[PDB]
Design an enzyme around this catalytic site. Structure first.
Site: not given
Ligand SMILES: CC(=O)N[C@@H](CCCNC(=N)N)C(=O)O
Ligand SMILES: *[C@@H]1O[C@H](CO)[C@@H](O)[C@H](O)[C@H]1NC(C)=O
Length: 246
Positions: A160, A71, A163
């Site tokens: 998550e 994100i 995924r």
């Molecule tokens: C760490 C993770 O998965 N994070 C979030 C998004 C974080 C965006 N910024 C960075 N990764 N630096 C997501 O939406 O999945």
């Protein structure tokens, strides 16, 4: 774009949202029958907009990088917010350009920075559909400490869950009662890059991981993943981060 409404939400409507989120991410191939996210996407098409509505019908739009499900930022009424990281500042060139003002949050988007800002690890932060409703609510008005926790809830219940089928089901179990994530959930989040790479290196290696991936299971038991026949590969993982981004 994809949308999710907390008002009237149930396990079925949440599963439909997570399926729409997965199906919005482009891919040209599957690796072991799992969509392989693109190396790169140029311009505005890089960003998916997810419209989320709290129980009262108030809304934020969240921008998601389609190559890695990260994100980047979100819009709440006339204000945009972005992580303090180069990928997010790039996204701010393409999305929510019509916001009256842009606030850069005082952290980047990775779990370690967000947990520091929130003052707690995500082992201690309840997640679920009620926690998601609270998160969208928090985000509607700027408060950078409250927003860090809200964003930990938002990342886990959207990215998550897209995924990993296991995480989508954990959220569904929390449709009407929050609960902190299982140690297996935390393990999978932390392993997504690792897994994605090893599943890709397995083609060319007879389905065998070059390096094993260590996970915690549904029973709190620590296990080792060595090849594509494991349930984590055949059933759980739904999207692969491209090795070009690893
Ligand atoms: C760490 C993770 O998965 N994070 C979030 C998004 C974080 C965006 N910024 C960075 N990764 N630096 C997501 O939406 O999945
Ligand atoms: C492959 O993975 C399965 C399930 O985890 C395991 O039982 C088996 O020992 C592994 N096979 C090889 C050749 O490593």
């Amino acid at each position: 774009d994809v949308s999710f409404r907390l008002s009237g939400a149930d396990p079925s409507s949440y599963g439909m949202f997570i399926k729409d989120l997965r199906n919005a991410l482009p891919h040209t191939e599957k690796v072991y029958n799992i969509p392989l996210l693109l190396p790169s996407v140029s311009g505005a098409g890089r960003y998916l907009l997810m419209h989320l509505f709290n129980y009262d019908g108030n809304t934020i739009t969240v921008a998601v990088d389609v190559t890695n499900v990260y994100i980047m930022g979100y819009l709440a009424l006339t204000t945009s917010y972005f992580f303090n990281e180069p990928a997010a500042d790039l996204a701010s060139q393409y999305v929510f350009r019509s916001a009256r003002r842009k606030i850069t949050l005082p952290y980047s988007g990775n779990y370690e920075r967000l947990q520091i800002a929130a003052g707690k690890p995500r082992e201690k932060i309840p997640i679920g559909l009620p926690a998601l409703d609270t998160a969208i609510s928090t985000l509607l008005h700027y408060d950078s400490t409250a927003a860090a926790g809200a964003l930990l809830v938002l990342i886990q219940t959207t990215a998550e869950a897209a995924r990993f089928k296991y995480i989508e089901q954990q959220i569904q179990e929390r449709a009407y009662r929050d609960e902190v994530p299982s140690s297996a959930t935390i393990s999978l989040e932390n392993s997504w890059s690792g897994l994605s790479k090893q599943i890709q290196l397995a083609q060319g290696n007879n389905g065998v991981f070059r390096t094993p991936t260590v996970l915690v299971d549904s029973k709190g038991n620590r296990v080792q993943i060595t090849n594509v026949t494991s349930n984590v590969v055949t059933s759980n993982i739904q999207l692969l981060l491209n090795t070009k981004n690893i």
